[PDB]
Write a protein that binds this DNA or RNA. Structure first.
Lengths: 68, 213, 125, 141
RNA sequence: CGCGGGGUGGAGCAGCCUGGUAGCUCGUCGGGCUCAUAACCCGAAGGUCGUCGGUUCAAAUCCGGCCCCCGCAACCA
RNA sequence: GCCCGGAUAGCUCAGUCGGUAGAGCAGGGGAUUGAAAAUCCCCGUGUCCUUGGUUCGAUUCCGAGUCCGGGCACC
RNA sequence: GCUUGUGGCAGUCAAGCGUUCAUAGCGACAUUGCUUUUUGAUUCUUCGAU
RNA sequence: GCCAGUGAAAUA
RNA sequence: GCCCAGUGCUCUGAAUGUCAAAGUGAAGAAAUUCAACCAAGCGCGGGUAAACGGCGGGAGUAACUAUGACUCUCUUAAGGUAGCCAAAUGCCUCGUCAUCUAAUUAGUGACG
RNA sequence: CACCGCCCGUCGCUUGUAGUAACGAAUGGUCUGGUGAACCUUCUGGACUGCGACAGCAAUGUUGCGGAAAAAUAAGUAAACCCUACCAUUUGGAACAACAAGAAGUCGUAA
RNA sequence: GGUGGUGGUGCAUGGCCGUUC
RNA sequence: GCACGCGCGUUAC
RNA sequence: GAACCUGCGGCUUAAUUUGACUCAACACGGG
RNA sequence: CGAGGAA
RNA sequence: GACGAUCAGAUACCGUC
RNA sequence: GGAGGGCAAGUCAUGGUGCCAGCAGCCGCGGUAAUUCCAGCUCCAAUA
C-alpha cells in the first residue's frame, strides 16, 4: 500500500495520563523508597521463597488494598 | 461317355437276353438320364418335349396342396396333403415338408406362404423333391397334370427322373442311341450352354446294361 | 353447443332452498365426495360464511362490464360453493394473492387447488 | 606430537603458519581486504541523501507485511540505497526529495530477520530526528 | 475400356474363403475403486455391411449387374 | 512522400446486410477456508479517436485530416 | 509521337479558419486552366539491327 | 418329411 | 542432426497377377481364330541419403503487463539438430541498439 | 502436524543483484624519444665609472690601467609540454542475457 | 440497563457420545 | 420442490 | 440392475431450517 | 422386472 | 545407435542385435 | 530506554488494532479473547 501508513496510530483513541497526584522524588530518595518497598528487613524477613513480585500490584485496586 | 460306344449301349445292346433265341413277346426299352439335378426350384427346366414320350411306369401320386380347396385339388385323382393347421407347427421341417412334397414326381400345387419359406415350408424340400414348380396352378392340377400324369413327353423335376422311347424290339442303331438322345431335349440341353452337365448314368431295356463306361 | 354439470340454476335453488341456513344445505351434501361431506357434516367454520357474502357483493355491484372486485382470502381450505361461481377470488399461496375466475367445474373442489403453492422446476447447469 | 612443530629454532615456521592459517577468519579477511571502504557509506557510520521515492517491501517467511522504505541517493558516494523507515507513521513525514540521514541495522550485512534486501535505517528528515517527529510535543515542519 | 484386389458405427482395423453370432481401439456418455487425487476398471448409445438383384430356410458371408478406390494393360481415328 | 491498418472501461482486446456496447485483468461486495490461495456469482467504470456528410437515428455505412502500426525510395 | 484521365502546378467565387476582422497569412464547396522528368492509354516510326 | 419352419442358409 | 513416402539406385527375396516370338491344345475344309501354360521385365517385398533431394503448419495456455520450456490439436517420410546472419542469401529495409562522424541508404559490433 | 511423509531438476513466475576477467574513463606514478623556460658556473662584452700622464688654471679632451651594468656563450641542474611503453588506485556500462532467493506455479518422480 | 433467543463460534468450554477397541 | 449423481432399504422377476 | 420408500448431494424456489461427510455422514440428530 | 456389468 | 516389449509416458530398469 | 525468553521488571483477565499497522539484536510476536504492535496504568534498569 502506502496510503495505509500508520493506520494503527491514527485509529488509536488518545487516552490522557493521570496528572501526578503529588510528585515522584528523584534522587537518593527514589532509590531510598525502592530500598524500603522491597529490600527493607520486613520483606527479607518473610521467606525469600514466598515474597511477592515487584509488579503483581499491576495497579489492581482490589489487591492494592488487601496488601496495605 | 458321349462316344462311338453309344450304339454299343443301344445297337450292340439290344438283344443280349440271358437264355436262348430271343423270346416271343413284345419289347420294352428306353434311355435313362435325369431332370437337371439342380435343386427343384431356382432353375432346371422350362418347356419343350423331345421325345422321349411316356408317363408313369409305376404310381404317380406326387404333390399338391395348400388350403381346404387343395384337397379337391387331389380328390378326383390322388396326391399328398399340406394341411391347414400345420404350417404353424408341423407341415415342414425335414420329414414333414417332405411328406407333402416328397413322393416321386415333383409338385403341382399352387402358392401361399408369406414371410415363411427361408427355412421351413417352401424351403426345406427343394432339392429333396419339390419347391414350387411350373404346373399351371390356376385352374387346378390336372390339365397341367398332363405335365404330371400322362403325355408326356417327360416332365423331369423333383429328384432326377425322366423318360425315353423310340422303337419296339429290334430295328434301331445310329437312331437307337441317337433315339436315346432324341429321347432327351430340355433335359439333355437347353438355352445358354447346356450340352452336358453331369458325370454318368445308366440304360438298357430289360437285357443287360448298356454303356460299360 | 356446451352445457354444465348439474344445472347451475337447480343448485342456486338447491343451495338457497327453503332452508338456506348453513352455507351447504344438506342438498348439496348428496353431491359432494365423502371427504367434503365429511367436513361439512362435521364442523365447518362461520368465517367461511362472511367470506361467502363478500363475493356476493362483488358479483352484483359490478356492472356487466365484467370487472369483478377481487375478494382476498387465506381460506384455501374452502370448498367452492355453487353460488361462488363467476367471482374472481384472490387466494394466498405463500407469497401473494392469486386471482382465479371461478368456473362451474371447480365446485366441490378445494379452493386451494388453484392457488399454486410452489413454482415447479425448470432446469440447467 | 601434534601437527604444530615444537622446536626452539622453528619460531619462523610457526609465525608464518599463523599469519597464513589466519586468513580463514572472516572478521580478519574482512577488514584486511579494505572491504569496509567499498560499501555504500565508504566505511562511514552515517550518510546524507535525497529521497528518490517511498517504496514498500513485503515481509519474508512467517511474516506478511508492507514495510515502509525510502530509496535514497547518497551524496558524495552517489548510490541507490534501500532504507527502512522506522516506527509507525514515520513514512508520513518523509516527503520525496527531502534530505535524509541513514545508518545500518545490526552489523552491516544481514538486514533485520523480516526485511529482504534492506540494509539501512532512516533517522533524519530535512535534518530533523525522526523520533522527534514521532512524538508530538517535539518537532514538525 | 481389358485383367485383379476393395468399400462393414464418427475414425482407423476385424467377421467373409470356414453362410446362422457383426468384434477391437480411439471417441461420446454414465458408474466403480480410493481416506482422497491421479491412474485404473465396468457398463451404455451407435453400422443400413457401397448399391441393386439371384441361389438359399437363412446372405456382411457365395453369385452375379451397376457406383466410386487402388493396381496392373492399352492401339483410337 | 504515396498502399492497406488499429483507435472501444483502469491496461490488453470483438460487433444483424446500423438500431444493443462486451468478456478478460485491475476491482470492491460475497459464497468458500480453520485463515488463505484457486474458484463461482455479483458492482462499477465510456460520444466505441476529431471533423464533415448518408438516415428517423451512426460507435458501426461513407469522405479527409490524426497517432502509432507491417510492405514501395539517382545512375 | 499524339491525349492528359491519373501526377504535378498555378486560378477564379468567397462560406470558412485566422480569438476582434472573409484575402496580412491561408481558404470548403463549386468552377476555368497550364504542365509533359510520373503513370495510363494509343500502336504511327523502327525485329528485311535500335 | 411336408402344408407349420426359424435362422445368415433346411434334408430322405 | 532427422527424414527411404516421392525419384533414382540396388538383394537370395514375394504362397500368388500380367507378361513376345517360336513350342503345345482345341475348332473348321484351311485360310485362319479361340485357348493354356510362358524368360526377362513389370507390379509386391527389403536395404539405400559423404544418392537427387527433402526439414510443416493453429489454438488454448497469469500470478501489472507482454509472455512459453506447458498441454490440446489437424496433420506429410521427417517437421531445421548442432551451429550462423540484415552476411554475397533478409522481402518490407534506409531492419532496431550501440559504435565510428560536426553528419553515415557506408562501414563494424550486437539482437532472431 | 509422523508416506495422504519428505523431496529433485527442467521451464515458468514473483521479488531482486551486479561479482570475477577484459575494456573505458579519472587521479597519481614510472619508462621511451624529443621540445626546453629559469638559474649556478664559464668564455666572452664592456655602457658607466675610479686612478695616473699629456692637451687648459678650469668644464672638457687623448691614451694607459682598474672595477663594472645590458648583451651574448658553452657545458650543467632541470621546470613544464609532447610522444612511446607500463604500474597503482578508483569509478563506469546496456536490450537479450546472467546470477540470487522463494513457492500447494508446470512435467514428471531422482533420492 | 436487563430479561429471552433452535442466532454465531465444539477449534473458548463443561456434560455426554462415537473412534482408535 | 425436479434434468440428474450417491446411500440404507421395501417388493419382485 | 428394476419400481417404489427413505436419507445426502445438485438444481430450482418467495423459502425449500440446519448438523454431520473414509470407516469415526446419508431411515443418523429417536428426523 | 425375465435373476441383474465393474464392483 | 537400431530394434522389440513395458508402461498414461520410457529414446529407462527385461529382451534381440 | 524496557517490562514473553536471553535480559532486571505486569498472573493487569484494561482500551484500540486483527498477519493489516507495526515490533523484533537473535528466538519469534500479530490472522477478534495479542504477556513483543498503538496507548493507559503499574513496574524495572542506568540515572544528569
Amino acid at each position: 500500500t502506502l496510503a495505509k501508513a500508520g493506520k494503527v496510530r491514527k485509529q488509536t483513541p488518545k487516552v490522557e495520563k493521570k496528572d501526578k497526584p503529588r510528585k515522584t522524588p528523584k534522587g537518593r530518595s527514589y532509590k531510598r523508597i525502592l530500598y524500603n518497598r522491597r529490600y527493607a528487613p520486613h520483606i527479607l524477613a518473610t521467606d525469600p521463597k514466598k515474597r511477592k513480585s515487584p509488579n503483581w500490584h499491576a495497579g489492581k485496586k482490589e489487591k492494592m488494598d488487601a496488601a496495605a | 461317355i458321349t462316344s462311338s460306344q453309344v450304339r454299343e449301349h443301344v445297337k450292340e445292346l439290344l438283344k443280349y437276353s440271358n437264355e436262348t433265341k430271343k423270346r416271343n413277346f413284345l419289347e420294352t426299352v428306353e434311355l435313362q438320364v435325369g431332370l437337371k439335378n439342380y435343386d427343384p426350384q431356382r432353375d432346371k427346366r422350362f418347356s419343350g418335349s423331345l421325345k422321349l414320350p411316356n408317363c408313369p411306369r409305376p404310381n404317380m401320386s406326387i404333390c399338391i396342396f395348400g388350403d381346404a380347396f387343395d384337397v379337391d385339388r387331389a380328390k378326383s385323382c390322388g396326391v399328398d396333403a399340406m394341411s391347414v393347421d400345420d404350417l404353424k407347427k408341423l407341415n415342414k421341417n425335414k420329414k414333414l415338408i417332405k411328406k407333402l412334397s416328397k413322393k416321386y414326381n415333383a409338385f403341382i400345387a399352387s402358392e401361399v406362404l408369406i414371410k415363411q419359406v427361408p427355412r421351413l415350408l417352401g424351403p426345406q424340400l427343394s432339392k429333396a423333391g419339390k419347391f414350387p414348380t411350373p404346373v399351371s396352378h390356376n385352374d387346378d392340377l390336372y390339365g397341367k397334370v398332363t405335365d404330371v400324369r400322362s403325355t408326356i413327353k417327360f416332365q423331369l423335376k423333383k429328384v432326377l427322373c425322366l423318360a425315353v422311347a423310340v422303337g419296339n424290339v429290334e430295328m434301331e442303331e445310329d437312331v437307337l442311341v441317337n433315339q436315346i438322345l432324341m429321347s432327351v431335349n430340355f433335359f439333355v440341353s437347353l438355352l445358354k450352354k447346356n450340352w452336358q452337365n453331369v458325370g454318368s448314368l445308366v440304360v438298357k431295356s430289360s437285357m443287360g446294361p448298356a454303356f460299360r463306361l | 353447443f356446451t352445457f354444465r354439470g348439474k344445472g347451475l340454476e337447480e343448485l342456486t335453488a338447491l343451495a338457497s332452498g327453503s332452508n338456506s341456513e348453513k352455507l351447504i344445505s344438506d342438498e348439496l351434501a348428496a353431491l359432494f365426495d365423502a371427504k367434503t361431506r365429511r367436513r361439512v357434516k362435521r364442523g365447518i367454520s362461520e368465517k367461511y360464511a362472511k367470506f361467502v357474502n363478500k363475493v356476493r357483493r362483488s358479483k352484483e355491484k359490478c356492472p356487466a362490464g365484467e370487472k369483478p372486485v377481487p375478494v382476498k382470502t387465506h381460506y384455501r381450505s374452502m370448498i367452492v360453493i355453487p353460488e361462488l361461481v363467476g367471482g374472481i377470488v384472490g387466494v394466498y399461496n405463500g407469497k401473494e394473492f392469486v386471482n382465479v375466475e371461478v368456473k362451474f367445474d371447480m365446485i366441490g373442489k378445494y379452493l386451494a387447488e388453484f392457488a399454486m403453492t410452489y413454482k415447479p422446476t425448470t432446469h440447467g447447469k | 606430537g601434534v601437527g604444530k612443530p615444537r622446536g626452539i629454532r622453528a619460531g619462523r615456521k610457526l609465525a608464518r603458519h599463523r599469519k597464513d592459517q589466519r586468513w580463514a577468519d572472516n572478521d580478519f579477511n574482512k577488514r584486511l581486504l579494505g572491504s569496509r571502504w567499498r560499501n555504500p557509506f565508504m566505511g562511514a557510520s552515517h550518510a546524507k541523501g535525497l529521497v528518490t521515492e517511498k517504496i514498500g517491501i513485503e515481509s519474508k517467511q512467517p511474516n506478511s507485511a508492507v514495510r515502509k522504505c525510502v530509496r535514497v541517493l547518497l551524496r558524495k558516494n552517489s548510490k541507490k540505497i534501500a532504507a527502512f523507515v522506522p516506527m509507525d507513521g514515520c513514512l508520513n513525514f518523509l516527503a520525496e526529495n527531502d534530505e535524509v540521514l541513514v545508518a545500518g541495522l545490526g552489523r552491516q550485512g544481514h538486514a533485520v530477520g523480516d526485511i529482504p534486501g534492506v540494509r539501512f535505517k532512516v533517522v533524519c528528515v530535512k535534518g530533523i530526528s525522526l523520533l522527534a517527529l514521532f512524538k508530538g510535543k517535539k518537532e514538525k515542519r
